[PDB]
Every structure is written in C-alpha cells, then in structure tokens.
Design a protein around this ligand. Structure first.
Ligand code: HEM
Ligand code: HEM
Ligand SMILES: Cc1cc(N)nc(CCc2cncc(CCCN(C)C)c2)c1
Ligand SMILES: Cc1cc(N)nc(CCc2cncc(CCCN(C)C)c2)c1
Ligand SMILES: C[C@H](O)[C@H](O)[C@H]1CNc2nc(N)[nH]c(=O)c2N1
Ligand SMILES: C[C@H](O)[C@H](O)[C@H]1CNc2nc(N)[nH]c(=O)c2N1
Ligand SMILES: [Cl-]
Ligand SMILES: [Cl-]
Ligand SMILES: [Zn+2]
Lengths: 403, 405
C-alpha cells in the first residue's frame, strides 16, 4: 500500500502518503532497483498539469474554491485552448520555485525551503540582458559573505524556438586545461566547458583556480561570452587551524554554489534557464571537489605532508587526510565570515525537516544515497533513517547540454 | 542502446549493461512510482517443481552438462520424488553449488570476491539439539583456525512437511549480552537485549559485564530450544589497543574474531534450510564504526573524543569524525597484532570492484545494494561510491526469516 518508513536509531515509524501524489515515473521496477543511477536513461496533458498547479497555489494561500481560483483556472484553460500554452503570474512563479526546491529529493538543505529570493527575469530578450540579471543575482546572493538563497528565472521554453540557456553548469567554475601529457591542470570536471569557452574566443589562463567566463545563449543565437567582474566572485583561501603547512598548498574555493544547468518545471511550463544558489555544506568542497580521484585529488599530497604511511590502506591515511581537509574548509570559511554548514549540522536540520514535512504533507521525497554525506555516513542521523524516493512537481530536472 | 540497465562508473567514465537481472524471478519493493531501495526489511508442488527445475538447470550449466542425459535424468528424478512425497532432496554436490551460489547472489555483501572458496559442512544428518551444538563447535574451530580465518557454512536438515524447523535462535554464533538496567540504560550490547532476556528465561545465569559471551539457544524439531554454553577457549577475542594513543588500551574494549550469521534462511531450488549458519572474517568498519560507534549500540564516540581532548561542544570541530577514525585504526591494529584475519574498508571495496568485473564477464552483471556496499565511514574515498549498481533478487538466496518465538 503506502510505504512504512522506519528510523533504526530511535525505532520510530511513519507512513508516506505523499508519494501517492506522484505523476511521474522513476527508473525502478519490481524486478530491479535502479535507485543508484545518477541520470535518467533517457494539450490535454499540459492542461491537466496546469490545473493541478493552480490548485496547489490556491490551496497554499488558503483560498481554494474562491472566485479568484475559478477565474484563474478559466484563464489558463482559455490561453491553452487558443495558443497551445499559457503564462504564470509572478506570485505563482514565486510559489512554484519554492515548491521545486522543497520537492528536490537530492537536497539536504531543504529546511530552508520557504526562504528563497525570487528574481523574475522573464522580460529578458538577449544574452547581454541575461548577464546583467546574473551579476545582480550574484551580488545579492553573496552579500559580503552573509549568503542568501536566490533564484533568477529566465523566459520559459516556447514550441518551435530555441531555449534560453546558460552553458556553464554553475555560475562559478574553475578552468580545467587538458595538457597533452595525459593530465589535467585545474578542475577535471570542467574540461569540456573550458574548451568550449576558448573556442568561443576566451583568452585562457594557466592556473589551478582560474574563474571561467559565462557562455550565455538567447534563442536560436550563438552563445556569447561574458567575464565576471572579479569583485563579484568572493573566494576563500584555505588554511588549517593547526597545520601551518596547509596554506602553502595554494588551495581555495569560491563562496557561492549556484547551479545553472537545470530545468525548472512548473505547471507544465519549462524554464530552461533558472540558476539557483544557496550556501555550501562543507563536504561538497572538502570531500568531493578536493578529494575525488577524478577532481583535484589532493589526498596523497596532504597525507605526505602529514607524514602518514602512504604504503598501506590499513593505516587509514586517506581517512585522516580527508578529515583534516574538511576541517580546513570549515575553519577557513568561518574565518572569512562566509556562510557554511558542516555535515553534522546539515543532516540534523534535515531530520527536523523530515518531521516538519511529515506533519505538513504526510511525507518527504528523499534520495538516501545523496542525503547521506560522503564521509562519516553512519555518524549522522540520516544514515539510520529509511527514506522514500519519488518525483513531485514543481520540480528541478536535468536537461541535455546545449552543444 | 541495448535493452538492459546501463551502468556507469563516474570515476573512470566506463559503462556496462546488466543482462543478468533478466534471470530474476522474484520482485523487490520498488515501483516506477517510488523507490524503496533504502528500506532494511522490505515486506504447492507446482510452485516447488518450477523452482526445483530452475536450480537443477543452474547446476547442470555450472558443470557444462546442460541438455545431457544425466541432466534430463536428474530432472526426471526430482519430479518423481516431489510427485510421491511433496518434496525432494539435493545431492551433495548440488548442496555445495547451492551454498556458494547463495553467497554469490547476496546483494548486501561486499566480501563476495571470495565466493568460490567456501567450506560447506553437510549436517543434514543432524537429529538433536545436542548434535547441532557439536556441529556448531566444529564449525567454530575450523572457521577460526587460530586466527587464520576460513569461510564456512554448516547446513542442517531442510524444512519438512508437517514437522518443526531446526532453528538457531541467536542472530550470530558469538554475541555479547545486553543487560537492561534499573535506570533504563543498557550494559553491554543493546542490539542483544531480547536474546539475552530469552536466555535468562530459559535458565541461563547472567553475568554483569559489557562483554559477556551469550550461550546458544538451539532448537531441534518440535522441541523447546536447549541452552548451550560455548567453552571459552573456542571463542577467540581481540583486546583493542591503539598504535599511538597509549590510553586506548585502558578502555578495556574488545571484539570477537568470528562473524557468523545464524538466523538467516538458506533457500535452494525451493528447498528451505532454516538453520544454516555461515561465517567469514570481518571488515573493520563493522566493528569500529557500527558496533562501537552507533548511538543505539556501544556508543563510545564521546568517551573516545573526551580522551583525545576534542571539542565535543560543537559539530564543526569534527570531533565525531576524528574519534571514529582512531577507533577504526585501533580495530585494524589490534587484529593485525593478534594475527587474526581482517580487511579494512579500502581493501574490501577495491576487491569488490574486482569482483564486479569478474561477474560482468562470467554472468553479465552482479546484483548489488549500493547503500550496504558503500562503507559507513569515508564513503566517497572508496571506489564503490562512484559505481552505479543494479539491485535484484536471484536464487539460490540467503533470506530473512521471522524470529522463532
Ligand atoms: C541553503 C542551503 C543549501 C544547502 C546547505 C544545500 C545542500 C545541498 C547538497 C549538499 C546537495 C548535493 C549536491 C551534490 O552532491 O552535487 C544539494 C543538491 C541540490 N540542491 Fe540544495 N542546498 C541548499 C540550497 C538549495 C536551493 C536554494 C535550491 C533551489 C532553489 C536547492 C536545490 C537543489 C537541487 C535541485 C539539488 C540536486 C542537484 C543535482 O542533482 O545536480 N538547494 N543541495
Ligand atoms: C569472507 C569475508 C567476508 C566479508 C569481508 C564480508 C563482508 C560483509 C559485510 C561488511 C556485510 C555487511 C553486514 C552489515 O552491515 O550488517 C556483509 C553482509 C552479508 N554477507 Fe558477507 N562477508 C564475508 C563472507 C560472507 C560469507 C562466507 C557469506 C555466506 C556464505 C556471506 C553472506 C552475507 C550475507 C547474506 C549478508 C547480508 C546479511 C544481512 O542482510 O543481514 N558473507 N558481509
Ligand atoms: C543551491 C546549492 C547549494 C549547495 N550547497 N550545493 C548545490 C549543488 C552544487 C554542486 C556540488 N557538487 C557537484 C555539483 C554537480 C552536480 C551535477 N549533477 C548532474 C549530478 C553541484 C546547490
Ligand atoms: C559472514 C559474514 C561476514 C561479515 N564480515 N559480516 C557478516 C554480517 C555480520 C553482521 C554485522 N553487523 C550486523 C549484523 C546484523 C545483521 C542485521 N540484518 C538482519 C539486518 C550482522 C557476515
Ligand atoms: C553511483 C552513485 O549513485 C553516485 O556516485 C552518487 C552517490 N551519492 C551522491 N551524493 C551526493 N550528494 N552527490 C553525488 O554526486 C553522489 N553521487
Ligand atoms: C536506513 C538504511 O537503509 C540503514 O541504516 C542501512 C544503510 N546501509 C547499511 N549498510 C550496511 N552494510 N549495514 C547496515 O546495517 C546498513 N544500514
Ligand atoms: Cl560544487
Ligand atoms: Cl557484527
Ligand atoms: Zn529502487
């Protein structure tokens, strides 16, 4: 029937009835679970999604059945029947953006979901205008290190017309230059975007942390290249509270995590450019970005500096170096007065969020493999909590690369 | 592309397709509408015969005699036996193949690289609780081997029509007592509170330590379980010390050498073996992270962090992470010093990636439960974190079964 959901540390049980509201298939079947896969393998419809969303909106303002609610439904209907599409009012877009964050199964930061600044950028007609909105978004969100969550929404997709797109996967990305002796200098995750930039006329650097320009694209136009003003990109030098040699590693990370390659779907409408930002959880930087073998891969370097036995796995040299790197990220962001949350505090807030949502909506869609942090899993409460994963709309979705 | 799940490793960029999942004949808990992958326990002769035939086919394939005269004859013999008695019996070599294949098929086990080297003790002649005990002690002595641990399974008689099961009530052959206290706390292992109280109900005189080895409650068919004390010399333990933190030894922590699971059901060709205890050797995180640091287990994290003089008043000091690493190191160092087989989570996961490649070639895939395969500390520092996995049920299988009481 409905999933019985148990927490194995406390022995407490809930039941998810929210999943019954899902209208979209995930990748699992009774024959086999594909829950660990990162990406998906691959007018009456629009109208029914539209109506459902308008229903969500009016219920949320506690005015279901009001004349305003009936009129709005007819507007949507008349617009679709005539034009094949429709448009949201700003207040609907604001509600929609918040629900999409709220519904995002892979996000451990959802306790913050109702606090989101929404910039309406739907009156955008050029890449140059896109750039101006983006600079303002960054300036607002960064806020001298007192980070504020925000989203900017660019014009929706229209049939038989190219999309508005930001080609970069994030607003801030460090270059990855592939030197022909096999290796990569910089961030291996951004090799393809770096090359795309150079090809579109960017003068490349040759450092480990060169901030990339943005490639911005208006419909059916070649993308345009814009360099972000260095004073807009707040960055944090990494040092360690006790290990003085750590700063000599020349490591740093940027303050603002702003994803810019995802599609925002609201009521059947699709926003192909809608970058969103919040603040970092430390493990993203300290564990994944710096310690992944296919990223900066600094584990061995830090270990050799800590004079650890690199010869055998059984000395746990990797685990020790990783802890210290995460410590340095936390220490450095704290010294710089830049908002950051550690994985213990984040997962503790998520448990509170699960409980809030259980009372509010009867469940919470969550992807266990993503919610549990990449170091010290079972040391956090979420490890011991069963979760149900399913797709609710409004939603953030992946979409193909524009190139 | 091919019409099978596509499986990617995000570290290496390499891609495989799982075709083995096509052979699954039993559903798990997921649907296209919602994934239940994270749940720990998810919820007639014609039915027996098809399970039986499938297994005999599997057996004859494994010896490259599929379609042979002996194959058709063994099939014919299984149908005849089921037809006249409602059940059938496995030849010795079929039981051995079945036991190894159940291990090979176990989605939650990271140690499967070793699957082909499993010593199978045939105990289907056992007729008493006392005899079960003799078999179990023999298993323990062989598997323990003075610290040079050897994988083994002992198989007691199958479930039979209208007759009680053979059962071992304890969840493992070695378990530390958990004594419920007057204030509500637990002395010992909280995981074992219930089995401890059952032992006392059945006549065990209880100790009062943190590490009292429990007696075994053993049940022969249609009889009350009998109580058996393991002679201490048979139960190898390892006192825990740390290679540099000299005070760690003073904590008086220890763990037993042999992980031997005893409450699972071994299913083969529809036959059900309700008592089939199996053992290997530990991965160090099972002891160092889960058993010692889980909040609902021994919960020693704060004790150790205080000894290490860490800031336990704030999450951002990473005092939990720091203490947990040193505890795992102590586990590894103590087992190594004691010459008792053990594998760290890095070596174990590397060996499992090797296993995945072997099985891709041998069977076109490998059923695996990501959440269980990725270790409870240092997750993304191990190669399995970045490997997509397909989970599904194959038979022969080890299955959960309800508690006997
Ligand atoms: C405010 C503090 C926030 C924290 C601490 C946080 C934390 C996280 C973390 C750790 C991840 C995993 C990312 C990865 O491993 O690659 C994630 C993913 C995600 N977050 Fe949040 N987040 C925050 C704000 C937001 C906001 C404002 C939004 C949208 C409005 C959002 C939506 C998402 C989405 C859609 C993903 C999945 C990304 C993907 O699948 O590629 N988050 N978050
Ligand atoms: C040889 C060394 C072995 C190692 C290092 C190993 C490792 C592990 C680990 C770390 C787990 C996770 C347990 C947990 O978190 O509760 C596990 C589970 C499991 N193992 Fe292995 N194992 C080994 C041998 C065996 C053998 C010999 C068998 C059977 C013949 C086996 C069958 C299983 C099964 C069925 C589970 C799942 C149990 C459950 O879900 O309660 N393993 N193993
Ligand atoms: C709003 C927000 C806040 C935050 N702390 N992290 C994020 C995600 C940032 C992030 C971190 N590592 C990696 C990625 C890339 C993910 C790519 N997808 C396709 C798996 C993104 C977003
Ligand atoms: C053969 C074998 C080897 C090994 N290293 N571990 C095991 C599992 C032992 C084990 C460890 N922690 C916890 C448990 C309890 C299992 C809980 N199941 C029933 C959900 C069992 C078995
Ligand atoms: C294969 C596996 O699904 C994949 O590597 C996932 C695991 N969990 C994750 N969790 C987070 N937060 N971010 C990730 O990129 C991943 N990667
Ligand atoms: C809720 C979650 O499924 C549960 O805590 C699981 C997670 N992964 C695990 N993995 C292993 N090896 N052992 C476990 O007990 C668990 N517990
Ligand atoms: Cl990032
Ligand atoms: Cl154990
Ligand atoms: Zn699933």
């Amino acid at each position: 029937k409905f999933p019985r959901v148990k927490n194995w540390e406390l022995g407490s049980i809930t039941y998810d009835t929210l999943c019954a509201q899902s209208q979209q298939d995930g990748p699992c079947t009774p024959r086999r679970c594909l829950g660990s896969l990162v990406l998906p393998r691959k007018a009456e419809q629009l109208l029914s999604q539209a109506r459902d969303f308008i229903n969500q909106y009016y219920s949320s303002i506690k005015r279901s059945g009001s004349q305003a609610h009936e009129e709005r439904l007819q507007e949507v209907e008349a617009e679709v029947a005539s034009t094949g599409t429709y448009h949201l009012r700003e207040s609907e877009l604001v509600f929609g953006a918040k629900q999409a964050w709220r519904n995002a199964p892979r996000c451990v930061g959802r306790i913050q979901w109702g606090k989101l600044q929404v910039f309406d950028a739907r009156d955008c007609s050029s890449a140059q205008e896109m750039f101006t909105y983006i600079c303002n978004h960054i300036k607002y969100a960064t806020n001298r290190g007192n980070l504020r969550s925000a989203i900017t929404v660019f014009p929706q997709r229209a049939p038989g017309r190219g999309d508005f797109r930001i080609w970069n996967s994030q607003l801030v990305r460090y270059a990855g230059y592939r030197q022909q002796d096999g290796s990569v200098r910089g961030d291996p995750a951004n090799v393809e975007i770096t090359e795309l930039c150079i090809q579109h006329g960017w003068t490349p650097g040759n450092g480990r942390f060169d901030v990339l320009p943005l490639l911005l694209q208006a419909p059916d136009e070649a993308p345009e290249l814009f360099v972000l003003p260095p004073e807009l990109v707040l960055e944090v030098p990494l040092e360690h509270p006790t290990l003085e040699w750590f700063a000599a590693l020349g490591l740093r990370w940027y303050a603002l995590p702003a994803v810019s390659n995802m599609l925002l779907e609201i009521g059947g409408l699709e926003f192909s450019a809608a970058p969103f930002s919040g603040w970092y959880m430390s493990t993203e930087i300290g564990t994944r970005n710096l310690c992944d073998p296919h990223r900066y891969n600094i584990l061995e370097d830090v270990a050799v500096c800590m004079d650890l036995d690199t010869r055998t796995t059984s000395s746990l040299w990797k685990d020790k170096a990783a802890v210290e790197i995460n410590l340095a990220v936390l220490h450095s962001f704290q010294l710089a007065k830049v908002t950051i949350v550690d994985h213990h505090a984040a997962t503790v807030s998520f448990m509170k969020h699960l409980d809030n949502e259980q009372k509010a909506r009867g469940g919470c869609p969550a992807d266990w493999a993503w919610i549990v942090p990449p170091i010290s899993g079972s040391l956090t409460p979420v490890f011991h909590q069963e979760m149900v994963n399913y797709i609710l709309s409004p939603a953030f979705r992946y979409q193909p690369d524009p190139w």
